[PDB]
A paper describes a structure:
Compound 2 is characterized by two methylene groups between the functional groups (n=2). In the complex structure with KDM4D, this leads to a shift of the tetrazole ring relative to its position in the complex with compound 1, whereas the hydrazide group remains unchanged. In its major conformation (64 % occupancy), the side chain has moved by 3.6 Å relative to its position in the structure with shorter compound 1. The aromatic stacking interactions are still present, with distances between the centers of the aromatic rings of 4.3 and 4.6 Å for Phe189 and Tyr181, respectively.
The five members of the KDM4 subfamily (KDM4A–E) catalyze the removal of the methyl group from tri‐ and dimethylated lysine residue 9 in histone 3 (H3K9me3/me2). All of the ligands (1–7) reported in this study occupy the native cofactor binding site, which is in close vicinity to the metal binding site and the site binding the methylated histone lysine.
Residue numbers in the entry: 11 to 340
Amino acid sequence: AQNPNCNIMIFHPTKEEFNDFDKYIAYMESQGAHRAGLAKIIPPKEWKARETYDNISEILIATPLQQVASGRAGVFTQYHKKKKAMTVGEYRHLANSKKYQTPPHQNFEDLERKYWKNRIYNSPIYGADISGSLFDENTKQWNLGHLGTIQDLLEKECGVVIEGVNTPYLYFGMWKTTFAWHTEDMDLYSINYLHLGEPKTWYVVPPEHGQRLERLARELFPGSSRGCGAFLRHKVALISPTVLKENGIPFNRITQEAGEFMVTFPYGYHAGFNHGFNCAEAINFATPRWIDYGKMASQCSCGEARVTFSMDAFVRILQPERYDLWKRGQ
Ligand SMILES: [NH3+]NC(=O)CCc1nn[nH]n1
Ligand SMILES: [Cl-]
Ligand code: NA
Ligand code: NI
Ligand SMILES: [Zn+2]
């Protein structure tokens, strides 16, 4: 078996290899990449997402989110306080202000150390889940707005025709902006392109070990676990690498830089943080291998994890027994 230690693999496709998206995902899996739960893909030198980022400042962040932490440095939750709208230009200025800018640091490891030491003591502001795309329409390879849809995948594999769409999201981050531990809706894949700016550090648990992370999370967040048997899909809980190591949880870490893609695989728990101002684009997708995962995916029915109406069909078809309960939750 390939990649038995579940290491994060890094791929360097040639321009020819970059033509057929599906084929390359399948290739990465043939090499065991999925075992890690996350892979990095560095595009060929001839590729670009768009010509420049000079003209993005007028994008609106309709509901910036202030990420207010509670707990202890290595075990905390975050809640998202809504703020007044602002443009990307305004957000960038805020990120670079003395209150929010990245501190002086020696390297990525020193910054990681500062993050886990001090994150709770600050409340960075996050632009999240903004429908849109920054890929040029003429970019034919790895254009996250032009992928095959999950609905079409489900139709091709299972013969059922369903409603719903599948479009990308933009994320605008600053120092200490945090994404909590989670797997995707219905344990889908995700793909993530860092368009512009400072790095984004990722942590990931191998899919074969995701239940170990869940068990730890129930111990560390006991009231949340009593409230919902799938509370990680609320996307609020953070656990540091130090705490994961103390508890024997298998995981890996890697830093993504501008111009790089990250793929998360079905049931690969991930979390991470931004180093400074940046802009990313992401979308969920499926392959034939996902179907099994979608059938088995846990669900939040407590009401906290509201999601896209696209999800309805996925639950309805893949998990008919669970559908009426999940729907009440929505
Ligand atoms: N699936 N992709 C993710 O969970 C990353 C979400 C994110 N990327 N930048 N800010 N938030
Ligand atoms: Cl700091
Ligand atoms: Na490892
Ligand atoms: Ni995710
Ligand atoms: Zn819930």
